[PDB]
RNA sequence: GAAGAGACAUAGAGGGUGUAGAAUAAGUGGGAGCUUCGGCGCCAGUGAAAUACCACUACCUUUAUAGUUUCUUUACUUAUUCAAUGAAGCGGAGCUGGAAUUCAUUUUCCACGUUCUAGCAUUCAAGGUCCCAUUCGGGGCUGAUCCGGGUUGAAGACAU
RNA sequence: AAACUCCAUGUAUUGGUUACCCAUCUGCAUCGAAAACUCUCCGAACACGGUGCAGUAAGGCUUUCAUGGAGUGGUUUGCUAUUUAGCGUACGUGUACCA
């Protein structure tokens, strides 16, 4: 069951977006976030998952993604407009996990190859997967343009020890109807994945990234 | 200047009690007997057991706030010996050796008038 | 380990006006709380103290005052 | 009703150790931005973690609003229970007498016509004072303080 | 007589870092004898303590072929006011410990 009052959430979204756009304004590409909590949920004893939902458009069009793979997907990434690297260097670079964590922080999302599934868990395993941006390998025959656009419009659900899961949704510079569609589809998917449906979720607070404190529910 | 407790050494035969109380006597601080320091059952009243018992009392008298003691020496009293045991002198001496100041040492052996019948019979304990 | 001595209040004891210096000594009691309070456990205490302590003169080394 | 031990709501805290960076770091994704500082973070080193902004707050104690399904204890009386009597003097306040070393504060507390004697104790009670219309007598008040109409005692949300 | 514990080079997935190996919740075989009636035997007994197996992983679910090299021998749970120590000093399991 949808426990959301549609007219009230539409008015709340329109006033929040008016606040983020017209009352206050900055060139900072702000990112609206859904930080959904958990009530009467025990993360440790209950089975979890790492899942990937899709979005109608990019939550933030200035989000960097990196690729590792063969020279073919390297040149495809060059046509894409995203930086590409080799894999022999990473074999030496496995030693400094500090530098691996630094590069994982600098490149906040990674993608790999079906041949790189051989070498990834021994070299790029620990720090990158601790960062949790799980690389889904691309297909050389499939469209790297399409895969880049997919990663532009992906959402990663990583239910961890904390009971508050927070993921970005969109922006303010783009349109608003698709943003409302994004928030509504995200809460519907979260309600569907929750194993007690609306009982686990306790609140749904969206806040314009540079804004004040308020509680929706 | 000095925080005062009451030492209350019970020095009978067969044992020795070092029972430091508060100044009013109601609250107990470190009652350590001679049987708590040696396990031989014939030297519980011995001076060595009493000196160890007294210094363990002074070990807890410090780190609670007690820096000086009023000493009350006790034999068995009643219809019994009225003479302090061999361990009262060692326990009293060890309290002074441990840094706890002393004041108004007093003998508080319970002394009857003539009283109920002492045990032993008419011919007494004959061995 | 319990250590019941870290939970007492360390009061102070006075003397009546019919004496010399009236600081007799401290008293270790309990922290007064609810559920069988330890405030009235200080109403009936009896203290034996020498008169020379209460007067400062050794001429009353005997006559302990209750 | 009151007190204590609560818990759940309540609304606001802040803070939280190794390492080692630019802070004694348990947190999110951020790529640069509100501005009293060109200060903080940023492309920079080095850190299990990048740092303004918490935005949901893991985990909170501390409160003062204001709480409600409790657990114990302690009180109240009006349910219930017990007893008595021809339901006669209960409770509160007084007046008097005393003790109170009044401090111009009933501040306090006791007493309230009876104890040598197997007598007697009743006629709305005599007296005093007021009014009769006083027709031989009659009626008030006081005698015999006032007030509350809770008969009195026990017990009590236990017991039954 | 030699055996086995570990690191690296890495082949299928050995995978998902508070990183296989922190792992225990749980069941399934029992570590054999005090210098004991000297010893020994069978039997009443479910084991007289750690390893092995599985379902449960504060990594999402199997342990994968291999090779090279580092590597041992002792202190015994006790008694006694000789206590920074004086006597006494079973083996089979892991501890504590050393060089």
UniProtKB/Swiss-Prot annotation, chain B:
Transmembrane segments: none
GO terms, molecular function: mRNA binding; structural constituent of ribosome
Subcellular location as annotated: Cytoplasm; Nucleus, Nucleolus
Biased composition (Basic residues): 118-127
Residue numbers spanned by region Disordered: 107-127
The keyword Nucleus is assigned to this record: yes
Matching InterPro entries: Ribosomal_uS11 (IPR001971), Ribosomal_uS11_CS (IPR018102), Ribosomal_uS11_sf (IPR036967)
Keywords associated with the record: Acetylation, Cytoplasm, Nucleus, Ribonucleoprotein, Ribosomal protein, Ribosome biogenesis, rRNA processing
Predominant location: cytoplasm
Post-translational modification: N-terminally acetylated by acetyltransferase NatA.
One GO cellular component term noted in the UniProt record for this chain: cytosolic small ribosomal subunit
A biological process term (GO) from this entry: ribosomal small subunit assembly
Domain of life: Eukaryota
Pfam families from the UniProt entry: Ribosomal_S11
Function: Component of the ribosome, a large ribonucleoprotein complex responsible for the synthesis of proteins in the cell. The small ribosomal subunit (SSU) binds messenger RNAs (mRNAs) and translates the encoded message by selecting cognate aminoacyl-transfer RNA (tRNA) molecules. The large subunit (LSU) contains the ribosomal catalytic site termed the peptidyl transferase center (PTC), which catalyzes the formation of peptide bonds, thereby polymerizing the amino acids delivered by tRNAs into a polypeptide chain.
Assembly and oligomerization: Component of the small ribosomal subunit (SSU). Mature yeast ribosomes consist of a small (40S) and a large (60S) subunit. The 40S small subunit contains 1 molecule of ribosomal RNA (18S rRNA) and 33 different proteins (encoded by 57 genes). The large 60S subunit contains 3 rRNA molecules (25S, 5.8S and 5S rRNA) and 46 different proteins (encoded by 81 genes). uS11 interacts with eS1 forming part of the mRNA exit tunnel. uS11 interacts with snoRNA U3. uS11 interacts with MPP10. Component of the ribosomal small subunit (SSU) processome composed of at least 40 protein subunits and snoRNA U3.
Family: Belongs to the universal ribosomal protein uS11 family.
PANTHER family in alphabetical order: 40S RIBOSOMAL PROTEIN S14/30S RIBOSOMAL PROTEIN S11
Miscellaneous comment as given in the Swiss-Prot or TrEMBL entry: Present with 29600 molecules/cell in log phase SD medium.
Name this protein carries in UniProt: Small ribosomal subunit protein uS11A
Native organism taxonomy: Eukaryota, Fungi, Dikarya, Ascomycota, Saccharomycotina
């Amino acid at each position: 069951m949808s426990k959301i009052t549609s007219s009230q959430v539409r008015e709340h979204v329109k006033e929040l977006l008016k606040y983020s756009n017209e009352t206050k304004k900055r060139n900072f590409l702000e990112t609206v976030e859904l930080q959904v909590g958990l009530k009467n949920y025990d993360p440790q004893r209950d089975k979890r998952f790492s899942g990937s939902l899709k979005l109608p458009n990019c939550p933030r069009p200035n989000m960097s993604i990196c690729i590792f793979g063969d020279a073919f997907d390297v040149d495809r990434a060059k046509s894409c407009g995203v930086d590409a690297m080799s894999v022999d260097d990473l074999k030496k670079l496995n030693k400094n996990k500090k530098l691996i964590k630094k590069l994982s922080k600098k490149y906040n999302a990674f993608i790999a190859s079906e041949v790189l599934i051989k070498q990834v868990p021994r070299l790029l395993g620990p720090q990158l997967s601790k960062a949790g941006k799980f690389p889904t390998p691309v297909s050389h025959n499939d469209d790297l343009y399409g895969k880049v656009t997919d990663v532009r419009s992906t959402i990663k659900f990583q239910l961890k020890k904390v009971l508050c899961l927070a993921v970005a949704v969109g922006n303010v510079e783009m349109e608003e109807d698709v943003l409302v569609n994004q928030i509504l589809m995200s809460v519907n998917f979260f309600v569907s994945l929750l194993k007690k449906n609306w009982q686990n979720v306790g609140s749904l607070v969206v806040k314009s990234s540079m804004g004040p404190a308020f509680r929706l529910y | 200047s000095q925080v005062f407790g009451v030492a209350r050494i019970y020095a009978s035969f067969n044992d020795t009690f070092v029972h430091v109380t508060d100044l009013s006597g109601k609250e107990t601080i470190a009652r350590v007997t001679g049987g708590m320091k040696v396990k031989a059952d014939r030297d519980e009243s011995s001076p060595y057991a009493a000196m160890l018992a007294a210094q363990d009392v002074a070990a807890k008298c410090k780190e609670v706030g007690i820096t000086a003691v009023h000493v009350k020496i006790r034999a068995t009293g009643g219809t019994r010996t009225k003479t302090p045991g061999p361990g009262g002198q060692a326990a009293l001496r060890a309290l002074a050796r441990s840094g706890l100041r002393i004041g108004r040492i007093e003998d508080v052996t319970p002394v009857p008038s003539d009283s109920t019948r002492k045990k032993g019979g008419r011919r007494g304990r004959r061995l | 380990v319990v250590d019941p001595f870290t939970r007492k209040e360390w009061f102070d004891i006075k003397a009546p006006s019919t004496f010399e210096n009236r600081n007799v000594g401290k008293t270790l009691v309990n922290k007064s709380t609810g559920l069988k309070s330890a405030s009235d456990a200080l109403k009936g205490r009896v203290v034996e103290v020498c008169l020379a302590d209460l007067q400062g003169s050794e001429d009353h080394s005997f006559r302990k005052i209750k």
